[PDB]
Amino acid sequence: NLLLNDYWVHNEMKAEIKMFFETNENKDTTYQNLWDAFKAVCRGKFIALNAYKRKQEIKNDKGDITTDPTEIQTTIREYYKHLYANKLENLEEMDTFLDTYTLPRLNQEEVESLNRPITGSEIVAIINSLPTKKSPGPDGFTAEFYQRYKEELVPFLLKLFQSIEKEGILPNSFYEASIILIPKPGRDTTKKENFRPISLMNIDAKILNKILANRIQQHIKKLIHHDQVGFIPGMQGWFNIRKSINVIQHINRAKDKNHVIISIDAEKAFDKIQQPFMLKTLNKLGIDGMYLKIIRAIYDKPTANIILNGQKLEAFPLKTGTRQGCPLSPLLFNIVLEVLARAIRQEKEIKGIQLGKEEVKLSLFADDMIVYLENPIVSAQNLLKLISNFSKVSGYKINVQKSQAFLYNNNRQTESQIMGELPFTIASKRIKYLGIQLTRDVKDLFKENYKPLLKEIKEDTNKWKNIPCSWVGRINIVKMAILPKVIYRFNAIPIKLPMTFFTELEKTTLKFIWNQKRARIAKSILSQKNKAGGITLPDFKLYYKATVTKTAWYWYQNRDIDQWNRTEPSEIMPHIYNYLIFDKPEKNKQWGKDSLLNKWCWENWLAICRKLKLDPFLTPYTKINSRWIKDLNVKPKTIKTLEENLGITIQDIGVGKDFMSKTPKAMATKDKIDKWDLIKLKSFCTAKETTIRVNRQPTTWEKIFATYSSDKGLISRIYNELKQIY
RNA sequence: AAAAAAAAAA
């Protein structure tokens, strides 16, 4: 990195790049070996430049405790290679499972989009969007190499990529990788299976599959189901938590408790899937041409070298298991699990939980898959056989030791047959999920999710006390260490939190920032913006308030990829959860009791807007399909007529004296609109009140809840907005 | 200490 910032070295390497390749332009060889030789000559040149600058300036198989550096090499290497070398040869048996069920088929245009030749725009975007301060596959290189030498490799990489077009093979240096062993959180180091494989590959290799990932990233939503939320941009991890928690609330209210909840976690699923399976599934869903050709060469014979205690252990062929840390690998992880997800979904012998008209049966993540079952006498047994059959074709062995379950039964005699037969660790109190605890009882959801939470900072704040640093150095780590983690809890679990709860949370922080001393500056002044002299002190009371309103956005957009919002129980007339925000309010209809995470949002949604002195039921950002127009008898087809034309807001449609007539294309639309609809709609905005309500400039608050579809920093806008009003 | 989750911290 330091050598990469030298102007003389930069010019020398620019000259070497310019007059190196055009010295042996021979047709006898290929471009991959020339590429590797260019890497080697770059390594030699950097070695020479560094020299010039320096001149100028655990338990074994028997269970015994072993500490010998030579002995441990023979154990972990054998254990890793034993699992990695086991490649399934039952190719004919493998295809039978795939033909049993159905997988999506990509349209030719999408395949052509994946088969589209790499342009000069993808190269610049990926290299620009390359995070720094990281370590790739060694190569004697670093990440800053391609972020500084962009100009000479912008056309050159296409030439390197053009070689793949006529060959479909990868360079020998592309296959190398560096698996880094890091311990799992809160696990003993004595067991050889408690380490995490972190394989770092070449930046050039890391680039290559990224477009392969990026090309399928634009099509991943069509491929996999919406149930999986792992590593899918536009989808958040807490989706399952809210989805899952609603089930226990349903199970608690349900008098007939005979359903079972299991959190199936797999032991190192990142490395125990079969390359033949993942290659043929990629063939089975319509992918072919270059995409099938290039993906075959990527995993034709991948290998990785182990590094431990400063030893460059020799590499070995990864016969099975996708490479860890590859950006494309998680996308492939979903697909191999996707057919698994469909297999359980399409298995009608095992039934899912029917929440009204919504069918909820299972959920996925990276490793912590959860399946909801009822009548475990048959359904649970039917679950095991499919996984073993999937394991028989993929090596997907479920970690029954580390995976718990939740049993809800009314007869103790029936319960005895579960632990006796089902080998799952039936935990009757709580289970682990990404740091959250799905309590058996909803009344205990507050206790086991926040009482451990409040004491978590109690000893955490009991550590950063003796550091000789200023009071300014206390608030920043609060926003860095504890603040990011807590909002995960509110986002996953927005229960009505008593004011007493925030007392300990605030007071613990208060003694931390001043180091067990009285406040030197006013809290209100310090809570203001930097412009007014403040530091923007975190306010968890509003952060909880903001996070309760964070989910208020999803009702407006009503994306079909979110199902958890429809899981709330309702013993009365069906879903209205789409026509609530920015719509006419329904009278003589109040939610509560069974509803836990929706009514509180509405109670908090109305509270904030009333303080703003705003009418939320009629806004410029009102949806065209809002119930305000559905109050009277209207034709559903009529909304579809202008859905393709304007589609977004009633305001753009026209109001006042501009009934569906404000823009030239509307003149070509009114003919399509039914004439009984015109008289119905011409009376809608005739009233003066209806005009002023919409004919107004939208404020900042309504902006974020309509625009800003890339909902990544919704907290920042809402919390800042709540700071000003409150 | 990598793919992806995130608070923006400017």
Author numbering: 254 to 310, 393 to 1061
Please give sentences taken from the publication describing this entry:
The LINE-1 (L1) retrotransposon is an ancient genetic parasite that has written around one-third of the human genome through a ‘copy and paste’ mechanism catalysed by its multifunctional enzyme, open reading frame 2 protein (ORF2p). Human L1 encodes two proteins, ORF1p and ORF2p, the latter having endonuclease (EN) and RT activities, along with three other domains with unknown functions. We report structures of the human ORF2p ‘core’ (residues 238–1061, including the RT domain) by X-ray crystallography and cryo-electron microscopy in several conformational states. The structure reveals the fingers, palm and thumb of a characteristic right-hand RT fold but also shows key differences compared with other RTs. Two folded domains which we name ‘wrist’ (863–1061) and ‘tower’ (240–440, described below) are absent from other known structures of RT enzymes from viruses or mobile elements.
To understand the structural changes resulting from binding of the primer and template, we used single-particle cryo-electron microscopy (cryo-EM) to obtain reconstructions of ORF2p in three distinct states: in an active ternary complex with incoming dTTP and template–primer; bound to oligo-25(A) ssRNA; and in apo form (to 3.30, 3.66 and 4.06 Å resolution, respectively). This is the first reported structure of an RT bound with ssRNA in the active site. Comparison of heteroduplex and ssRNA-bound states revealed distinct template paths (template RMSD of 3.76 Å) but overall maintenance of similar contacts through movement of flexible loops, notably in the palm and wrist domains. Apo ORF2p, lacking bound nucleic acid, was unstable, with a melting temperature (Tm) of 34.1 ± 0.4 °C. ORF2p was markedly stabilized by binding single-stranded RNA (ssRNA) (ΔTm = 14.4 ± 0.6 °C) and further stabilized by binding an RNA:DNA hybrid (ΔTm from ssRNA-bound = 2.7 ± 0.4 °C, ΔTm from apo = 16.1 ± 0.4 °C). Modelling using molecular dynamics simulations and AlphaFold indicated that the tower lock is consistent with orphan density above the n+4 base in low-pass filtered cryo-EM maps of ssRNA-bound ORF2p and may therefore fold down and ‘cap’ the RNA template.
